[PDB]
Design brief:
- This protein is α+β, with helices and mostly antiparallel strands.
- The protein has 3 domains: 58 residues, DNA polymerase, domain 1; 114 residues, Beta Polymerase, domain 2; 69 residues, DNA polymerase, thumb domain (Beta Polymerase, domain 3, 2-Layer Sandwich).
- Helices cover 39% and strands 17% of the residues.
- Strands 2-4-7-6-5 form a 5-stranded mixed β-sheet, with helices on both faces. A two-stranded antiparallel ribbon has the order 1-3.
- A hairpin with a 4-residue loop joins strand 8 and strand 9.
- The longest helix has 18 residues.
- The chain is globular.
- Belongs to the DNA polymerase type-X family.
- This is DNA polymerase beta.
- Its EC number is 2.7.7.7, 4.2.99.-, 4.2.99.18.
- Its cofactor is Mg(2+).
- Monomer. Binds single-stranded DNA (ssDNA). Interacts with APEX1, LIG1, LIG3, FEN1, PCNA and XRCC1. Interacts with HUWE1/ARF-BP1, STUB1/CHIP and USP47. Interacts with FAM168A.
Amino acid sequence: DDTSSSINFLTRVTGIGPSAARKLVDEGIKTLEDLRKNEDKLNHHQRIGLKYFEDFEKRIPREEMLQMQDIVLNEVKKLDPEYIATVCGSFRRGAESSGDMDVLLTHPNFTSESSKQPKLLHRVVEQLQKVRFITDTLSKGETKFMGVCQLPSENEYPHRRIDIRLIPKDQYYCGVLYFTGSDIFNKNMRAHALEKGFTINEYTIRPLGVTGVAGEPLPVDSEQDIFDYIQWRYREPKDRSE
């Protein structure tokens, strides 16, 4: 009803999951002004999403992505030019507008064998904060950061959603591929690989076998490699709609 209508609303709130939404409905919380009057029952993630509720409903136009992407690439490079960072999302595909920003990061010192290097990701976050680009943090893991950013004002820009993920170097390309999309694309590509005797996921490419349940990840130094393995002409992100 006009009240379910209320669960529908809350849930627009980043951080506000159903279960999560439901309870707040049981507390008498339904509108947003409700929410603001009740910051104390929301977690850190939900507060922030509440705080930028509107801004978050706004799309990001390419022009801004471009600048955002430059700020990020640039800071990273100063920290250690050995780091590799790529912005995925339809944006990499050439998209005219975006909803948020996705940066996949990596570094040769961090391979799927190490597994334990928070500092590599935190140091970038720190730098991005110290430069005034990232303005807030929703949550921050050892391998993933989710927060808020804003383009520097000269005089203002809405706050945007930014995610930065640290992936091991030996699995970075499957990830970039993976997060670049599109969805169909991945699908048709995974389908084909199979016909070629390979199984791909967001982390590896592995040859099949008898009965099927087979494996052992093939070395991948670029996105190009995955296309070679299945012997398909390379496809520039822009041609990845399907």
